[PDB]
Amino acid sequence: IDPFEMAVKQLERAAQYMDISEEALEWLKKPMRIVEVSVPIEMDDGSVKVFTGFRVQHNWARGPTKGGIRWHPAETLSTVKALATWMTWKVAVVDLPYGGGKGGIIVNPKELSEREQERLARAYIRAVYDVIGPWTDIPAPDVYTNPKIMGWMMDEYETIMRRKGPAFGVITGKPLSIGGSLGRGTATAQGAIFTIREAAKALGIDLKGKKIAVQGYGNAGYYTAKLAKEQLGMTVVAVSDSRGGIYNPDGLDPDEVLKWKREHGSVKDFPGATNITNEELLELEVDVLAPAAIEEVITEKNADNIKAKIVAEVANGPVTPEADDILREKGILQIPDFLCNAGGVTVSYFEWVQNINGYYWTEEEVREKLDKKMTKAFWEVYNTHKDKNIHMRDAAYVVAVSRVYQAMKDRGWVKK
Ligand SMILES: NC(=O)C1=CN([C@@H]2O[C@H](COP(=O)(O)OP(=O)(O)OC[C@H]3O[C@@H](n4cnc5c(N)ncnc54)[C@H](OP(=O)(O)O)[C@@H]3O)[C@@H](O)[C@H]2O)C=CC1
């Protein structure tokens, strides 16, 4: 299924639940600027290889576009366009002064050395300099890209820009030594925890003493479990990895589970815990479920057999639309995927603000501002959900598209 076709279909579906003009929908169905460039680098053997780079800016009505850069051998312009379109709604739902953007290079980084990767980053910056900037387009880490490459890109941009402004703010996800930000490691989990707390508040459920099951124990899953147990006081009873999952009604200690995973290569066979399958974890009777793993783990087949009161879509779309309808019919509140894991984008914006202002905050200030942002966004989505009598995800889409629509109307881009 073509990614851009899917994104356009999603946008039309969202527009079907709100009052939006045809001209605005047509404007939103097409990225405002797409830049495809050749990225030449010098190989370690002395040869020269040319790579294909992309930089799609879907919309900038609300402000400078924001989005990451992906280094995947299967990158396509369609995928970049779809991800920029999704990033637009991602930044619009949580009320950031950002638009939608995305980049990508068709390259396999597993076969490149450190020098070649640095050359690739610098050449990409040299190619796309004319369409990026602190107030035009702010790239970010993505798949097979890390803060190392962010530092290289920032250094190249500063070299080209002759230090005429906040070159630190041109890109986010940088190392702390050069314009970096605190709380970037646990941003997604912190946002998910705040959204879960607000959902419990909305449902009238006290989380102190309740049970939570987390699917996927990577950076997001482990930190979600850890932060839930620490702040929310929720008993973690089940975690899982690719290999399998474990269960214990008496509770799990996330630090010990992480230690065992980093020692035995997997979370399975944890002492005092019963081994369960991922499917079996989705079956447990808990009050919070946090899929932080592979996409499409909840389908029409197992949607009915879910007993969780709150499903926090920490991952990127772990629930299918049929499963969405079935789960909504069962009186279960869903937190949409691009609202639950909004911490990442929310944190990036804080980093950009720190770079622009020249003043960096502390871990507590970032945590409090993120708390405010996520609470406001979830509350703005839940109110739409209750007023329009539509699905949770649909409420978030309505909020984001309404925000973009209003910004477009204010600029005079669309007269209707
Ligand atoms: N973490 C972040 O900063 C943000 C995360 N996201 C989204 O969040 C999710 C996780 O992020 P991230 O922590 O970076 O991912 P990680 O790569 O750090 O970890 C992936 C985890 O999910 C597990 N996993 C991978 N495939 C499966 C599978 N088929 N079945 C069951 N478990 C699987 C991995 O298991 P194993 O360890 O055994 O390999 C691991 O536990 C993703 O869906 C991602 O798209 C996007 C926004 C930013």
Numbering used by the authors: 4 to 419
What do the study's own words say?
We have been studying the structure and dynamics of a homo-hexameric enzyme, glutamate dehydrogenase (GDH)18. Each subunit with molecular weight of 46–50 k folds into the core domain for the hexamer formation and the NAD domain to bind a cofactor molecule. GDH existing in both prokaryotes and eukaryotic cells catalyzes the oxidative deamination reaction to convert glutamate to 2-oxoglutarate and ammonia in the presence of the cofactor, such as, nicotinamide adenine dinucleotide phosphate in the oxidized form (NADP). In this study, we analyzed structures of glutamate dehydrogenase in the initial and steady stages of the reaction using cryoEM at near-atomic resolution.
